[model samples]
Target: PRNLAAWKISIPYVDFFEERIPVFCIDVERNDRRHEPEHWSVYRRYLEFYVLESKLTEFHGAFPDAQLPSKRIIGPKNYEFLKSKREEFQEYLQKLLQHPELSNSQLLADFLSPNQFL
Candidate 1:
């Protein structure tokens, strides 16, 4: 049997815990989709790495010993799940980059650019 599984990951905490980042939840009626798991996992990882990590590093550099939450807040289960789907996640992200609709969009642009720490 093929290894088919839906992976769920989340960053429960961040350095700037005071600010609220919008959480998006989608309800897919069916589970027959091939790349849905890869799609969601890669998207979430992108946000965490680009947005949260970038901001945290900036904050820390400006103020050493900053009391910011670590990326380990993502938890071991989720991390392992994401690790297992790394290849699929990369494929999904590549497809998104090649998508015509996202080619010129700000969302995609921001995603591609190096996130500003400050």
Candidate 2:
């Protein structure tokens, strides 16, 4: 059996969590068209915040000259504007889908992989 699974990624829905505040949901498929154990994982925006922050820190630690994306400050006055980083995260992931600097990033790859949870 050839276990050549091509990981797939896509943005499904931007759910309105707190009123008009949109939260991102990415649908992921871990196998190709002719594969089994065909489970999927959906990563929401809530978890992505931590993942992205950690990845940024990790990348900075690895390379100093690398220019990273700036994160917004989320305070009481503008929590929704700052916390609703759906577009930013989607764009960020699209960039990291394939990059020389992040080619061996297990974190990035795993983020789109099929996990046990929903």
Q: Against the true structure, what is each candidate's TM-score?
A: 0.33, 0.50
**CA error at residue 113 for candidate 1, angstroms:** 2.0
All-Cα superposition RMSD per candidate: 15.7, 6.0
Model 2 Cα displacement at 99 (Å)?
0.7
Which sections of candidate 2 miss by over 4 Å?
A: 1-8, 16-23, 29-39, 56-70, 75-84, 114-118
Overall lDDT per candidate, in order of appearance: 0.34, 0.52
- The clash count for each model shown is 0, 0
Q: Give candidate 2's error at residue 61 in angstroms.
A: 5.8
Candidate 1, residues 1-118, lDDT tens digits: the string is: 2112222223232222213332222211213245443333112342443453345345433323222233445445244444554454344434444444333444433433332311
Off by over 4 Å in 1: 1-78, 116-118
Relative to the true structure, candidate 1 reaches a TM of: 0.33
lDDT of candidate 2 vs native? 0.52
